[PDB]
Amino acid sequence: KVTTVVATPGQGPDRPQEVSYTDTKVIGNGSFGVVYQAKLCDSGELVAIKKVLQDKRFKNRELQIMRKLDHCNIVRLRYFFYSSGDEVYLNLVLDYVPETVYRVARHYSRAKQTLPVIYVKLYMYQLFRSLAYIHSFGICHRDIKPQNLLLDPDTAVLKLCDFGSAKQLVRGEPNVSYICSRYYRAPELIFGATDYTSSIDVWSAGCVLAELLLGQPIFPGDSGVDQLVEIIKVLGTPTREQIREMNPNYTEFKFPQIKAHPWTKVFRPRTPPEAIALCSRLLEYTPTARLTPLEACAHSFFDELRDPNVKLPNGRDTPALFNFTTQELSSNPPLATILIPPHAR
Numbered sequence: 001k002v003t004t005v006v007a008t009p010g011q012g013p014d015r016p017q018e019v020s021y022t023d024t025k026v027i028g029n030g031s032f033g034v035v036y037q038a039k040l041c042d043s044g045e046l047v048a049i050k051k052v053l054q055d056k057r058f059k060n061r062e063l064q065i066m067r068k069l070d071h072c073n074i075v076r077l078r079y080f081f082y083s084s085g086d087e088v089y090l091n092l093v094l095d096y097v098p099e100t101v102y103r104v105a106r107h108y109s110r111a112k113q114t115l116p117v118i119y120v121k122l123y124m125y126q127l128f129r130s131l132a133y134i135h136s137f138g139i140c141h142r143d144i145k146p147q148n149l150l151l152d153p154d155t156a157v158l159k160l161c162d163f164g165s166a167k168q169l170v171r172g173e174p175n176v177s178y179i180c181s182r183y184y185r186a187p188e189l190i191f192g193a194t195d196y197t198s199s200i201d202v203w204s205a206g207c208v209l210a211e212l213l214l215g216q217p218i219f220p221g222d223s224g225v226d227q228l229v230e231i232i233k234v235l236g237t238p239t240r241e242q243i244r245e246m247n248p249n250y251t252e253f254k255f256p257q258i259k260a261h262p263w264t265k266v267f268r269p270r271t272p273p274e275a276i277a278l279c280s281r282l283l284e285y286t287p288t289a290r291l292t293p294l295e296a297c298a299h300s301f302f303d304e305l306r307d308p309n310v311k312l313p314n315g316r317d318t319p320a321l322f323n324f325t326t327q328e329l330s331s332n333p334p335l336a337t338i339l340i341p342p343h344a345r
């Protein structure tokens with residue numbers, strides 16, 4: 001049974017073509033609508049179709065954002081197209097990838113084991129790459145979690161997915177506080193800040209990093225507000241100057257004073273010292289103090305990835321790690337001296 005639709009390519013001239021697919025099954029769910037799997041008849045390739053009720057009044061924020069993006073570490077919009085059920089739906093044809101960082105991290109910790117640190121370097125490097133790219137367009141993902149990191153287990157290619165909460169932030173225009181998933185939610189946001197930057201994504205990224213070294217979430221909060229407490233147990237009570245730097249909308253938390261539990265004691269003994277150094281510069285109260293995604297790719301914890309002889313545990317080559325663009329380097333072009341090593345010209 002074959003379905004044919006007239007779909008506009010996402011990274012293409014605005015020019016609709018016939019597309020056919022088969023083997024439709026449901027795989028996903030949300031306030032938005034539903035996600036299906038299908039097999040394209042052309043390539044036999046597997047894809048996901050995200051089906052979203054779309055008020056013809058509005059543009060679809062996710063769609064505008066997805067049409068700009070073109071990146072090895074971001075899920076690609078192959079096609080999009082409209083359908084019926086007045087009912088008008090947007091369908092987004094996106095990559096299907098069989099695993100996630102959530103699932104892999106979970107296999108390791110159901111077995112009490114540590115995810116090998118090579119994979120931590122591989123996965124995190126690619127996540128920071130993906131954020132460098134979108135942050136360069138002023139786009140904040142605002143939902144970085146291990147579950148939104150797609151993962152081809154054989155190639156080690158990580159792809160950032162799910163841009164339902166993503167947005168272009170412009171200084172001046174305020175934004176919602178209760179955003180991101182709780183465990184990965186920056187403290188600015190729990191203070192009610194509406195004037196935040198894309199450095200919230202970096203907080204979340206350091207939460208993913210921490211989780212991958214600990215085997216469970218670093219801040220498992222009972223509620224959007226117990227989330228602060230969980231954080232405070234680790235970083236300790238924020239100073240008056242840190243609280244000011246979060247440009248809050250409410251500080252009346254009447255929180256006890258807790259001393260900072262130092263970083264090296266948070267992780268299991270003989271965690272590599274560079275992972276902790278990176279981790280502490282992401283999970284900072286002051287949002288302006290956190291590394292930019294691109295400095296984070298340049299960090300010395302990822303040096304193993306820049307070694308000429310580096311290979312995956314399954315024998316194969318690493319994915320493309322060094323093929324930076326000008327768009328992708330914009331925020332700090334000198335970093336290319338470190339980022340793109342000798343042996344890749």
Ligand SMILES: CC(C)(C)Cc1[nH]nc2c1[C@](C)(c1ccccc1)C1=C(CC(C)(C)CC1=O)N2
Binds near residue numbers: 048098099103148161
């Ligand atoms: C590109 C989408 C819209 C994000 C769909 C997609 N593309 N590739 C995927 C997905 C799913 C449907 C997804 C949905 C939401 C967030 C992340 C992932 C998905 C997988 C792996 C699993 C094991 C089947 C679990 C699963 O939910 N892989």
